[PDB]
Design an enzyme around this catalytic site. Structure first.
Site, short mmCIF file in Angstrom:
data_model
loop_
_atom_site.label_atom_id
_atom_site.label_comp_id
_atom_site.label_asym_id
_atom_site.label_seq_id
_atom_site.Cartn_x
_atom_site.Cartn_y
_atom_site.Cartn_z
CG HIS A 264 -4.69 6.57 -0.54
ND1 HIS A 264 -4.49 5.18 -0.37
CD2 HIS A 264 -3.64 7.09 -1.23
CE1 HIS A 264 -3.31 4.93 -0.99
NE2 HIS A 264 -2.78 6.05 -1.50
CG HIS B 136 -10.29 4.79 3.59
ND1 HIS B 136 -11.08 3.74 3.19
CD2 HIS B 136 -9.18 4.78 2.81
CE1 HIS B 136 -10.47 3.12 2.17
NE2 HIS B 136 -9.29 3.72 1.91
CG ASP C 135 -5.71 4.04 3.05
OD1 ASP C 135 -5.28 4.88 2.25
OD2 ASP C 135 -5.94 3.00 2.39
CG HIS D 197 -1.67 1.20 1.53
ND1 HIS D 197 -1.54 1.96 2.67
CD2 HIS D 197 -2.61 1.81 0.75
CE1 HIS D 197 -2.40 2.99 2.58
NE2 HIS D 197 -3.08 2.95 1.42
ZN LIG Z 1 -5.43 3.81 0.84
#
Ligand SMILES: [Zn+2]
Length: 145
Positions: free
Chosen positions: A112, A110, A33, A29
């Site tokens: 990012h 959420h 987040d 990732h």
């Molecule tokens: Zn994310």
């Protein structure tokens, strides 16, 4: 009453920078987040300038900002709304946009947040967790929640 405390959990984070357990077997990732409802105000962590505004299928709405360093760049995914426009100068703690779920398929709304060095994309990314740990509001420099 004029005084009160509780033990309730601090930090709003979900998926941190590094390995990514929703992958079938292997994968990373490329950012951080934050668990934030739709219509949460999102702020610039550092003094920057807006350098693109767009949408895509995996991200939803995307804000792009360059830092004043001449080498660092930033992406904000899944947004509902924008307070700023391309070419506009911004400051640390200026409202840039609002959180939503405009590209999310699992694990709920959420932000990012993704920081990159020397160019723009996942190959240019660098770890924002220690970069947030130095901020005047910490991770709350990104969000009003
Ligand atoms: Zn994310």
């Amino acid at each position: 009453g004029s005084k009160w405390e509780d033990f309730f959990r601090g930090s709003r984070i979900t998926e941190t920078f590094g390995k990514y357990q929703h992958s079938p077997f292997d994968g990373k990732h490329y950012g951080i987040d934050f668990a934030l409802p739709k219509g949460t105000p999102i702020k610039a962590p550092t003094n920057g300038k807006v350098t693109r505004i767009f949408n895509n299928e995996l991200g939803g709405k995307v804000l792009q900002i360059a830092e004043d360093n001449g080498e660092y760049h930033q992406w904000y995914l899944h947004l509902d709304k924008y307070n700023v426009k391309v070419g506009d100068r911004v400051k640390a703690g200026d409202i840039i946009a609002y959180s939503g779920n405009t590209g999310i398929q699992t694990t709920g709304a959420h932000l990012h947040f993704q920081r990159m060095k020397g160019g723009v994309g996942n190959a240019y990314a660098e770890d924002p967790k220690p970069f947030i740990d130095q901020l005047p509001d910490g991770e709350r420099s990104l969000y009003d929640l």
